[PDB]
């Protein structure tokens, strides 16, 4: 990270770095322990360009690195749509977010870096970690992710909340799908339980709340 | 190791080769988290190659030290062949870049070197440590390597950069090869979906990040 | 056990005594692990006698501890020989490399001794833990095995049940010849005999025996 | 081709059209005779598109005036792009190579182009017609040519190095690739007899000329 | 060619390309007709290296060009020993006879060069292009070669001469060897009609025009 007294980079502690690659080792890089732990270290200092690919390549298994610099380009290309079409477009090119180039490519450039830029990056690295599988399976659509009978109801929902974490890009539009999609794909006994649906839900009580409320005498 | 007007000695830390023997013995010597620590490492001490014979006895199996060693010999053949073409050629002859003979045996005699010599033999260790092959099996051809069905392109194409960094020496010929047995050793399917493309890459993007983003569904 | 510009004397700090201990009970004392961090740890300080005293007894089993004493004062007995010979003979005595006698059974007497003594005990030390403790014909390359692999096997016996270095170092190429795979024995033919210069024999056997895998 | 210096164009005559046309059928529009032909035409003269559209249709099969023209477009295209990147920036567009346009349709317009989009229409046509296929088949991939049994080493290495100059533009990848491919993809025996030299520059000569002077007797 | 008028130097005309390619193509590359014309080329001019290169390359068949190349390579590691192995050693060193290097790679350094190291290279390059293969076979040892049941006697002597042309450096040799191998690795009946003949000279006829004019009639 940087310090600004003026700007001044250094290096990770091993300490971080040995914990960070036992943790993504065992709990698997999307559960919430080591989601809560990153951005913890996100906040707790001030990141460049160049510290995320020294994480990530120390962190990550290595065939999940190229999936996390996919997403990570893929991210910058939609930021640097948005950014053309502001008033004024603001002047943070695309280059600048990759740490390339003739004026963005080593640390003493980096150190520089102003406020926007690096709330820029933060946003697009933490949307850009989420992206990546366990190293065994690929992310299956709504309509393979089924509950079956003898089996706890809110596994379910778990589930098919990570599955709609994973691959949907807005979070309203990811929060509008998900109760529905729960419904529609239940148990049958359980859903007769929720087969009020509307008008037991006032607004402002989180509607995923009072579903479980209902099936929890099953088992 | 050497710290800095007159030049004095020092050792590592227990510490440092027990958790360094310990990381060889769990992950691999290839994984990127020791690949990530060895250059921590080393670019930011002053390693005389006794300090790298150390590194060498404490860490890894009775059979990768002669592996290691052999590839030393053959990276400093080449090496001390093309010092002799310069203009003028630098007078740092076979045996200061390995240790041995009467002129640089003995710790304060490599004590006291010059920055090239150890700038050179930083990048020769370096180069030596890379075609280390796993305690399992020796490498395979280029021709070998190629994906079946119901496996994620991301894991064939770190098989491929992986496979294509121990033999390749230089780094543009790796990054022209492996791009072309991407595009070749694929699976059928999502050959089709990589067929449109080659159609442009942008700037600040490389070619291998589109590939892995056009067949993110296929599993 | 440093001098700072006067000699002053420290103990060893009790992690890197502690991990010592780990590390000679995991793998054992002529593993190449223990063995170079040995060297790494000999080079970088002034190891005073009674301080490798100390480092072995802190160590080992009591049967190894008996070992290593016995052949330390064997190579002492033997380096003494020729202490003598060359000229102008030094005067370095037994009981200034044992750390016993009236004038070197203490810290401040063995404090001051001199660079040339150190360098003396130290060679004589690291080949006195070499020694710590029949068949030899049976080592063959077999199907599929790499060759690199081949030739650490039959580095290690050779070590075991030869006891001689000037020996065994023409033991193993003759061996590394005869007993490889026949598909790449051909393929070491045209080096047979010739040399080049700034390396041994077996290191260029490695450079033409990769890719048979 | 135009000459200025009675400055006009001429059309030449047709006994160059006779033999290009015998060339092009008999041998292959990508044996070496045509290409040192080709260039021998081509610098010694001054061509306007006009005149390439002449020839390529008046010496070849319909489907290799086809094949041709579709990556003449495709040479413009690129051409357009690295055009205007340039500081000063340059005023050669797509109508001005490509030989239509209200400014560019008649001989007379494009009879007056000076000396630099000559130069850069004869470093994109001539590219065109080396990737014109052969009227066998397709361009394969480089898995599927592979020396088999019986077959000698210097065509075959001759036909990887056609399918290395047609799918790869710049020569300095060319080099690297065809220099790693040439082995792993050969005959057991070749194989054996290339090994001990693997890698080894012995003196002032490339190393295709050791390799296939290793493996010569290899025929029966 | 070089005219000798600082001198002046030409590429070659288009015609004689033409019938070069021509008659490499149709016949062979070292069918006698094509050897009498190269002889008529390499004595009627004075050749430069780089002449020899454009003709070779303008005139072969991808596969053939290589392979002219690595006997070009290997005809110069003679020349380096037998040019310091006289005495006095001549001043004649590798990268002058292949135009490489940093001081004969281009037109202007090797226009001027002396009449030996022409000889050399033609010497070099003639013995260069007999070792040329045909298009896709290879040339096989004296040991498999047999006359057929059959077979004209005339015919069998023709390929016994075309392989003892390849595999032999000297030419006093490839005398004394084909007329030898000819009563060994004929027919039975050849065999028994030239047995009473064997090496007797009439008056001044060398020993092969006597052999097919006694197995002449064989149509059986």
């Not at 004026?103 to 926007?116: F, G, K």
């Not at 850009?128 to 190293?135: F, M, N, R, S, T």
């Not at 709609?164 to 999609?181: T, Y």
Request: proline fraction near 6%; charged fraction near 25%; glycine fraction near 6%.
């Amino acid at each position: 990270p940087v310090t600004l007294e003026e700007a001044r980079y250094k290096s990770f502690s091993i300490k971080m770095l040995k914990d960070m690659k036992e943790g993504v080792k065992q709990y698997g890089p999307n559960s919430p322990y080591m989601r809560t732990l990153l951005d913890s270290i996100a906040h707790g200092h001030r990141l460049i360009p160049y510290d995320w690919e020294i994480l990530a390549k120390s962190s990550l298994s290595p065939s999940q690195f190229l999936q996390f610099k996919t997403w990570w380009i893929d991210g910058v290309q939609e930021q640097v749509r948005r950014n053309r079409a502001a008033n004024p477009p603001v002047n943070i090119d695309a280059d600048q977010l990759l740490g390339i180039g003739q004026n963005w490519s080593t640390i003493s450039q980096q150190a520089l870096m102003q406020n926007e830029a690096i709330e820029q990056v933060r946003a697009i690295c933490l949307r850009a970690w989420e992206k990546i599988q366990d190293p065994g399976s690929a992310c299956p659509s709504f309509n393979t992710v089924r509950q079956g009978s003898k089996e706890p109801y809110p596994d379910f929902v778990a589930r098919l909340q990570d599955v709609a974490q994973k691959s949907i890009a807005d979070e309203k539009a990811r929060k509008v799908i998900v109760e529905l999609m729960a419904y529609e794909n239940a148990n049958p006994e359980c859903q007769s339980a929720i087969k009020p649906l509307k008008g037991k839900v006032p607004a402002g009580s989180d509607v995923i709340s009072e579903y479980v409320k209902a099936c929890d005498g099953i088992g």
